[PDB]
């Protein structure tokens, strides 16, 4: 039965010391939560398979297990390792010892050596005959069942026993709960602690959550949805089909021919319509050499050909080297030339006994032309001549063009299975796919079809002349929806772009969703899934899925004579955070690519300016970052300072001005923001030109200038102005009469101070507020870490270590390995620099936007809607931040409203009166005029409206009276 | 061949509902839902204020209301006829769709190139050559195909940056033209902007 | 005023007999404002100034012949190049 | 900047990229096709 075995069965995959690192390796490991056989040693000692290596663990109290035996038959017929542990002297022998019928313990050797509370775990594996021993000693206190915990096994001993181990056996003492696990080629992430001991591991194939952890290379997974793998169905059986032809190829008439033709008049025989069994030719020992240029020597048993030609002639031994593309001589150029793209192989052997008896019958003189003082010359072959002997050479020309085959090997066919994923082999063409019937009317002469990508589309079965389409076996993406591991270990799996067929089931348009309960009640969606569906973790707890809400429904009570005008207001402050600059990196081409290697540098010199042009690009980036900072901050010609007495009309700014008591005159808010944001390969970091103190001085000057002079320092010279009138004019600029400011000045000041306090609480409690800057810092650190890690890649060389390649190969091969490493590292540098250029362009655009907002928002007043936050803009205050700027936007937001009746015009004596500013309102009995953005009823008079035209044109005019202020002045 | 397309999060029905809500808000409340909450206002006074915003006295609107309404309706008929008769109107979107289709088709077509190998088909390479030569042919094909992917990705990043700039301009125009009234010359079309 | 920037607030220049000097860069003359709740500075006359703003508009319309560049007047090079497609 | 970019592109023809010679006519005049395809492929890759 399964138990919560967790992470048992992990051993050190190699002999490399590592610490404080997560290492991904592929080796033979124990599957997590797999079955391990539980054995007893009371009052169960079977022989188990070894496979490719076995993990061993045991718990003892009286040293029951004292020696392992490995072998195949255990019957004295082969060498068998015998280990005995008596006293404190380990003795190892591998002779053919005669064991008793039932081995037990009481309470031709090639390598001899002579010298529950505690579990001693071991790993014994045989690689190419080498017996490798790993072990670990640790105390535990558990007898009843499998121990819970993790323990890694170090290697100590390596015994060269040379036995291929496929089975093993234990020894029980009869008058010891031992454990056996099994290794599999799984990929594991091993975590090494500060002392270099692995304490945990993740099995990348245990389940989708383990797949997510393995993909993201961490033991913690953040909340969200990740795409981790792809589902693919496996084939079940192979199908081998060949034409059922039994004719044999007349190879005897070619290889055992009585006489070969002359090289000037060589024969060209066609072999076709037969089965070519190459096992006879392979088994013949008479051949001296077999060098093939066309096909690999091991593929001739499976592959078969459209045509074979046997070119038969005799050459001189020393000329055997001459039958090759690119070679020259009296043979290659004048009488027998081969194409340089020739496909096939030239096979030759001596024939001294019969071919030479002297033999003067062999005469010599574009590819394959037979051009039948003469140009004709001959050789004198004699039986007493190894090289000068007449070699018999046969050139087999193979046509590999995709066409009907007629000469295929002696392999029996199998039946064909339809509508199943199978591994097929048609005349040497292999692959996996589903073979189905088709309605494509191929012509009788057509054998292969092709797709746009040049892949095979259909084949004609060589036994039954039908056309079968090949459709790749079903596949698709798998997505994992998971909450963070600090909350729960429950996950949901989404099967992408498939229906719930081939795979608590909820059908969506994104795929097959398994594991989430469908809830009809809507809420705002948290973790989006797609196609309008989002998921969240809510309540006993489980994963739920629902259709996202777009907001509360609110119908409009529209009518032609009703207007709502705000009666009260609230002052709100928002925070806008923008990146301004990025780290000024610099890369040393020579030390990075060819670190302290003269030979590598000398080879690098052949590439000219390729890197230094990226060095130029990086210099340009470094300069433009300081240009951006300089342009963003240097908008004030002078450094202004506040008075010692902060008599600012009741507005408290002590929380935004520098604090003189600090070692650096920064404000408390700046301290809060600064308190929230937290090698030898040619990678360096340059300092900025403008220090933090200098930036703080610029921001202090800008703030003091703004408060003491309004917009005058921006427009021209800094002209001092009192803050209450500055505030009144900023209110006037948005269509709100200053008397509202004067009436509510104490409320506005208190609301501002309270909003700032709320900003302090928000910044002190919500870490995500500065994500826009944390993400850029993390991206740059990650890019540099990736560049450094990239040095570990091999790119095809025998070794990734430059000192080990230079220290291992002579120049003629070292230069090749070095050019390969240089090419790979140059591609890595080019990719890095290109990505940096694109990111720099994005940062530059952001900096230009920040400068525009700075200039058109702090120095003046913006009339652009939503340019400086939602609401009616008043002013902004800059604050510095690491690699960025934060704006505090003060906005006017209507708070309370009443439903009022309105009218387009008022008639007096038949004249139509229209408002200069504002709207007409009625409280139900009398008509009033008030400003659109603030309820402030005033009497409708002739000084608010003007006369144009008459009442008979305008639709919707209402009857009223218009007061003339002069009338009572002349009446009284 | 491993090339798939993901669905958008916001469906066409939801986008239509958002545009309907925005249009109903604009028509019933002018700029007030943009500044704060959606507060109802009659259309004739909204039009008078739109006239005041461009330096044209509202009395012209009120005196000429019947003709203005007839010209507005005739203009709307003109938009209907223009959209029903001018096919080139959607070229700006047709070219982007065509560019994405061309990029995907060229990426698929690239599989037919040899890059120096004896054959473009991997299964015939494996079925004909022993591993000691197969590693060379396969890494060469891998290098070529990886370079093709890298070129595709770079072009996609540059086009994405251009689309981002266009989207930012569209959002700025939406915010400063539909919810309010623009005094910026030729920012929201030629003439004195109303709505 | 900063002339040749060095870093970390330090700039260098060639000044006086002449020699290379290093100094802390100036941010401008210091000028405090005599701020009070009853003081305003108002300009009485003005000057009209003209400034020049220069912006790039276009760049050279280059065209590159890949075949002539890579395989100039070489039939064999052209035949090998033909295998790289688009 | 545009003049410098074009001058660098022209100068790039002088680089060898590992071949026995940077000059195409001496490559073609000295090597048989069976090695010429390799040398030409190397130059094509570098120039592309
Ligand atoms: C590994 O050891 C196994 C075990 O003896 C060897 O396999 C045996 O080979 C004989 C000879 O044909 C067969 O009759 C047996 O059936 C095989 N044993 C089993 C369990 O199947 C194998 O040859 C060895 N391999 C190497 C590489 O040493
Ligand atoms: C192969 O074809 C070539 C032409 O492609 C033939 O060349 C002729 O050779 C004879 C004698 O050398 C000349 O008199 C002719 O002028 C050549 N050209 C033509 C068109 O006849 C050559 O003879 C052919 N060889 C064989 C064996 O068929
Ligand atoms: C506008 O709303 C504000 C609150 O948002 C009101 O301020 C409160 O007014 C009540 C009424 O007397 C007092 O009890 C509170 O002391 C006020 N709060 C603060 C923080 O001052 C304000 O009165 C409203 N304006 C009008 C005209 O009613
Ligand atoms: C202006 O704001 C400051 C900062 O909140 C106020 O000083 C705080 O309150 C008392 C004053 O009685 C100080 O002793 C505290 O140390 C200050 N708090 C903190 C957290 O430092 C100051 O009173 C305010 N002044 C006016 C006129 O409103
Ligand atoms: C609507 O406003 C009008 C004018 O402010 C109110 O009419 C005045 O009511 C007061 C009652 O306190 C009287 O002293 C005045 O004589 C009225 N004005 C006139 C011109 O007669 C009216 O009461 C308000 N509507 C409601 C429902 O209260
Ligand atoms: C304002 O006053 C009168 C009735 O109180 C109306 O004005 C007249 O309306 C009749 C009916 O259409 C016309 O024949 C006259 O030409 C109008 N006279 C004037 C001087 O305009 C009018 O209907 C009233 N307004 C409302 C909204 O009821
Ligand atoms: C406005 O101030 C300017 C300051 O430049 C005055 O310019 C000069 O003023 C002096 C004073 O008499 C004259 O001698 C010059 O003729 C003026 N300059 C020029 C170019 O004419 C200017 O006079 C002042 N204007 C007034 C009306 O007082
Ligand atoms: C593991 O052992 C249990 C013992 O009851 C058995 O039921 C189960 O089938 C085994 N696992 C597998 C994969 O066979
Ligand atoms: C145990 O004692 C026997 C006694 O003869 C001895 O031969 C043997 O070597 C001892 N075991 C070991 C492992 O040395
Ligand atoms: C020991 O090995 C030899 C081979 O040198 C073999 O002839 C002999 O039979 C083997 N004897 C035993 C007991 O294994
Ligand atoms: C690592 O070794 C040091 C040596 O003193 C020890 O103090 C520390 O506890 C060890 N760490 C672990 C995780 O065992
Ligand atoms: C050639 O002759 C040998 C001698 O008996 C025979 O074994 C072999 O099968 C023959 N093969 C061919 C290809 O001629
Ligand atoms: C064997 O090949 C012949 C040749 O055409 C064909 O008629 C027949 O179908 C094949 N046999 C089978 C079992 O398909
Ligand atoms: C998750 O739990 C860890 C516990 O160390 C905590 O530090 C972290 O803030 C938590 N994250 C969330 C999103 O709750
Ligand atoms: C199942 O899903 C497929 C898409 O994968 C869809 O085409 C098909 O119509 C679905 N089946 C039913 C019965 O809706
Ligand atoms: C709507 O909610 C009810 C609640 O009982 C549920 O039974 C029903 O299946 C839901 N319908 C849909 C379409 O989700
Ligand atoms: C005013 O009308 C709105 C709808 O336009 C309605 O929601 C609200 O309740 C009304 N308020 C009063 C006081 O009648
Ligand atoms: C509002 O519409 C009603 C219904 O047609 C109409 O009777 C009334 O005169 C209109 N009032 C205004 C002010 O437009
Ligand atoms: C005028 O006021 C400014 C700033 O308030 C001050 O610097 C200057 O000295 C004052 N000049 C006179 C003449 O009062």
UniProtKB/Swiss-Prot annotation, chain C:
Cysteines joined through disulfide linkages: 2-11, 71-77
Residue window of the full protein shown: 661 to 758 of 1273
Documented effect of changing residue 29 to V: In strain: Beta/B.1.351, Iota/B.1.526
Function: Precursor of the fusion protein processed in the biosynthesis of the S protein and the formation of virus particle. Mediates fusion of the virion and cellular membranes by functioning as a class I viral fusion protein. Contains two viral fusion peptides that are unmasked after cleavage. The S2/S2' cleavage occurs during virus entry at the cell membrane by host TMPRSS2 or during endocytosis by host CSTL.
Organism: Severe acute respiratory syndrome coronavirus 2
Gene transcribed to yield this protein: S
Glycosylation (residues): 16, 37, 45
Origin: domain of life: Viruses
Name recorded for this polypeptide: Spike protein S2
